[PDB]
């Protein structure tokens, strides 16, 4: 469930 | 406007290279993972690459592994989709997206208009 | 990879009746961590892009009118037109959004039944 976004 | 303008499309040889470039503006470009999706005439969309925000790692459909790179620049708001190895089977409307992977909050996606490639001697 | 299966693939509605479109994923969508369904819709027209109209499988996107509405969850979705309008005919796409691969189904294409 990956998250490619800056956080 | 949050936009994005595709740019790069066209006529190229089987077997020959061509980049795609896509052009950001309206929005923080560098926070978001970013996508390039395609059409084949006749056919559905299909998701092509992705990659994260910084440019730290890249997913690709199986059938481009090998043969197509997904890249950015941040410090240009631009995405680029080096297409090496042409193929007729590559020939398609290319859209550069935003899409939805890891949302949150305040969500909002955002397509260019498409740039077409047609592989064909 | 989670693999994304429409039904029909197309679909005649008479004006002003109900529209039913049918998703399958290959593998649950739904997320433990914060109970969400990572599935999207999307209305795809000839010589445009396509339009979001639905994410978290039921959340509709802003200006999207309410005769539009998702439902289910895990691995079983349905996108509902309540009453096509003449503007509704496209090719409607759901997609999961829950992979770093993620696959937009085959497609429905709705149109007019005369």
């Known amino acids: 469930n990956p998250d490619p976004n800056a956080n | 406007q949050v936009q994005l303008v595709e740019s790069g499309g066209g006529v190229v040889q089987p077997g020959r290279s061509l980049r795609l470039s896509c052009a950001a503006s309206?929005?923080?470009?560098?926070?978001?993972?970013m996508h390039w999706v395609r059409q084949a005439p006749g056919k559905g969309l299909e998701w092509v690459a992705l990659?994260?925000?910084?440019?730290?790692?890249?997913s690709y459909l199986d059938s481009v592994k090998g043969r197509f790179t997904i890249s950015r620049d941040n410090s240009k708001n631009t995405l680029y989709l080096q297409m090496n190895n042409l193929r007729t089977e590559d020939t398609a409307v290319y859209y550069c997206?935003?899409?939805?992977?890891?949302?949150?909050?305040?969500?909002?996606?955002?397509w260019g208009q498409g740039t077409v490639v047609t592989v064909s001697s | 990879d989670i693999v994304m299966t429409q039904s029909p693939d197309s679909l005649a509605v008479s004006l002003g009746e109900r529209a039913t479109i049918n998703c399958r994923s290959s593998?649950?969508?739904?997320?433990?961590?914060?109970?969400?369904?990572?599935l999207a819709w999307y209305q795809h027209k000839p010589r445009q892009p396509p339009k979001l109209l639905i994410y978290?499988?039921?959340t509709r996107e802003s200006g999207v009118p309410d005769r539009f509405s998702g439902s289910g969850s895990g691995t079983d979705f349905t996108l509902t037109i309540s009453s096509l309008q003449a503007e509704d005919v496209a090719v409607y796409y759901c997609?999961?959004?829950?992979?770093?691969?993620?696959?937009f189904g085959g497609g429905t294409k709705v149109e007019i039944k005369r």
């Open positions: 997206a935003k899409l939805l992977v890891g949302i949150t909050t305040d969500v909002f996606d955002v």
């Open positions: 309206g929005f923080r470009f560098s926070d978001y993972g």
């Open positions: 990659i994260w925000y910084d440019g730290s790692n890249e």
């Open positions: 593998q649950s969508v739904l997320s433990s961590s914060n109970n969400k369904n990572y």
């Open positions: 978290w499988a039921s």
């Open positions: 997609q999961q959004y829950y992979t770093a691969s993620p696959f």
